[PDB]
Design a protein around this ligand. Structure first.
Ligand code: PRP
Ligand code: PRP
Ligand code: MG
Ligand code: MG
Ligand code: MG
Ligand code: MG
Ligand code: ZN
Ligand code: ZN
Lengths: 411, 411
């Protein structure tokens, strides 16, 4: 590195060489450049003074705090702006009182950068002056003071920030709503409830999102089961989107079988198929799967009306589980049919060997129109025994089965 | 409707007619079918008894509560299961004590359906018996008791549910973690902190998501600026994904100009370009835009290395705003270049008429290799004055400008 070369270039006669040396020492900043840059703050030209101030904040050494405090009283508003920004970047408590005075500066950029620096330092002494800054003539200063109050997290700012939600500027209302959510509490919850209902823009977005996780509280309010956010469906769209959809194809009895999820990735959701609460989760997964499958059929060219057959469930389930899973999957040219195929025995293959499954068949029975174009759907495929049996049985009845869907794959 | 026809079919001699009448009255359920269905609960066949019980819960009339309580002591476990489910669907407090006894049933399905019904009713009296049910031999009963305790929301269940996070079944741990998050509090926050760090599966997912919004609390912890969730980037991927990306194309000086967002949809994020906190939001938006644009170039066939030129920013910004916006956009065959194009005046067109803009030009200056394949990038297009001027200037210098990018559109 050339750190020591740039340190020498700070005392050059050429202005463009002195400036480039200060900017270079801001990127490749070493503690060796701190003392030479402190001297560069007393340069004749303001372009060198502001570049040295910028570089000192980028280095972050506590030695530059006192000369940067003197640079807050500089004749040039660009040098004052850089000194205020740098003081917050360093984060030393000594800059708090000098930065509080900079909040009353003539230049709106110096006021704004001093407010942001006070939030970066996080000292409680800045709370009252930043509350006054929420009534500045420049909206950029108001916005920066609201953001700084949220970074400090002092409750003394709650009522002034609630009044800032009625500001004329959209970015100021947004900064105030954010600051409120960062502080939290009962007065904030009540302000968010009014802002979500009557507010607009990004301020309303913050309020709506805050109430999804904090508000709406009740013993039994409908919530998402993977993130606990308030949601009418047991899986919010964000959580549903995060579920890994892995498409696989196997050929069983000449019929193509499509799976959409791996058992290892949705194990708990599958295990909860006979739970009261975790029941309505599977129709959400099959709706996601059916939407991708309908695109596959269009790419294939299979645009004929198709009729779904589900393996009829027994009294061991809370509701018509297969009917709900099939109703969710069906969309586009897919249409659901109920009670066409049923097993004469209620044996469970879960956790059983391939030998047990092959020796315990479900005696299938078909009851419906045989001239229709069908497809069968089931929740999971482990060994393919159940599907091979259903396909073989319907093939003997001369029934058109275009494909089979097994939502989840364990094979 | 045929409600009164099905009411008569309940007293038919044919078994298949009596069953279909009870099932039909469960879908097209009227209060007129309640008294006939109460009589159908005392049928000789269990298939009629369970269908009448199912239909009574679907109707939800309080008159069926007492005969369904008697149906909890039925000889058939399928009729008991249906009576327990229906009692929770109605939600009458009178079923609480009879359902508490059903938690000790021989059939694991009756115990499970009674636990879920107790959670639907929401009465506090079920808390202690449901806590005992968290130690059932059947994991489906344990899972249902954990879900029911979360629906009641009584704090007496916190410590037994914290012990359920160490259950041998994955769905039971998941149900217990959900129930804890639904109750909330300091003991829950501490249990979520250990579960997020040391747990696995969906139980860990719930814990991680709960801590993103409730935990990690500090005065200045890095948070998302649209949902307040803990996030190192000022916009979490979920919030970034929700931002409406609207691609538009205009031709300025023969050069195609691409925009990716509407000003009306990201107004506050654009307005905050010169704010300290809201600064790093725009490079996130241009990274999202550049990822879609790189797919457009591949579809077009423009696979040549392209070099980005940004309109150089002045001392009015916190950092190199254009450099950060260009660095975020560039990916794939797009490579960034800095300080090649600069305006000799710092006039601001924001909120000015088309007349003001056309009479106040930015005297552009190019400094770089002219033989390169370039593209220019800017944050917003309102009237196209700035872009028409930059393109016209570079065209006179015989410089290859393949296209222009204006992240945001106000035109
Ligand atoms: O590919 P396979 O080896 O045939 O296994 C798949 C079958 O296993 C499950 O049924 P199960 O018999 O366990 O019924 P259940 O719904 O009563 O648990 C599942 O619902 C499928 O029907
Ligand atoms: O399409 P147009 O009509 O030319 O307007 C677009 C220009 O307006 C803004 O610049 P501005 O002059 O406001 O600079 P600023 O960043 O200092 O506010 C923006 O950054 C573009 O340069
Ligand atoms: Mg099954
Ligand atoms: Mg559907
Ligand atoms: Mg500009
Ligand atoms: Mg990038
Ligand atoms: Zn969710
Ligand atoms: Zn977010």
């Amino acid at each position: 590195e050339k750190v020591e070369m740039y340190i020498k270039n700070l005392q050059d006669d050429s202005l463009t060489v002195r400036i480039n040396a200060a900017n270079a020492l801001g990127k490749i900043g070493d503690e060796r450049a701190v003392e030479p840059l402190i001297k560069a703050l007393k340069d004749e030209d303001a372009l060198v003074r502001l570049s040295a101030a910028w570089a000192l904040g980028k280095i972050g050494d506590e030695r530059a705090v006192e000369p940067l405090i003197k640079a807050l009283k500089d004749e040039d508003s660009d040098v004052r702006y850089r000194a205020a920004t740098a003081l917050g970047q360093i984060g030393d408590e000594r800059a708090v009182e000098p930065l509080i005075k900079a909040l009353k500066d003539e230049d709106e950029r110096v006021r704004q950068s001093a407010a942001g620096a006070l939030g970066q330092i996080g000292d409680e002494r800045a709370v009252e002056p930043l509350i006054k800054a929420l009534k500045d003539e420049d909206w950029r200063v108001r916005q920066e003071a609201a953001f700084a109050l949220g970074q400090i997290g002092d409750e003394r700012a709650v009522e002034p920030l609630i009044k800032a939600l009625k500001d004329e500027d959209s970015a100021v209302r947004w900064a105030a709503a954010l600051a409120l959510g960062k502080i939290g509490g009962e007065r904030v919850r009540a302000a968010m409830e009014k802002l979500a209902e009557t507010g607009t823009g990004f301020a309303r977005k913050v309020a709506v999102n805050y109430l999804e996780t904090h508000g709406g509280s009740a013993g039994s309010p409908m919530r998402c089961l993977t993130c606990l956010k308030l949601s009418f469906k047991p899986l919010c769209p964000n959580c549903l989107n995060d579920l890994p959809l892995s498409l696989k194809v196997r050929v069983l009895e000449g019929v193509s079988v499509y799976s959409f999820y791996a058992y290892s990735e949705i194990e708990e959701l599958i295990k909860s198929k006979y739970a009261l609460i975790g029941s309505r989760i599977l129709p959400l997964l099959s709706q996601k799967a059916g939407a991708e499958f309908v695109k596959i059929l269009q790419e294939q060219g299979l645009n004929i009306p198709l009729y779904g057959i589900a393996i009829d469930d027994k009294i061991k389930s809370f509701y018509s589980h297969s009917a709900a899973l099939l109703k969710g999957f069906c969309q586009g040219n897919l249409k659901p049919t109920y009670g066409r195929l049923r097993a004469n025995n209620a044996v469970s293959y879960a956790g059983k060997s391939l030998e047990f499954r092959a020796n315990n068949p479900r005696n299938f029975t078909f009851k419906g129109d045989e001239s229709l174009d069908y497809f069968l759907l089931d929740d999971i495929i482990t060994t393919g025994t159940t599907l091979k049996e259903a396909l073989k049985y319907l093939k003997t009845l001369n029934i058109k089965v275009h494909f089979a869907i097994a939502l989840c794959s364990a094979d």
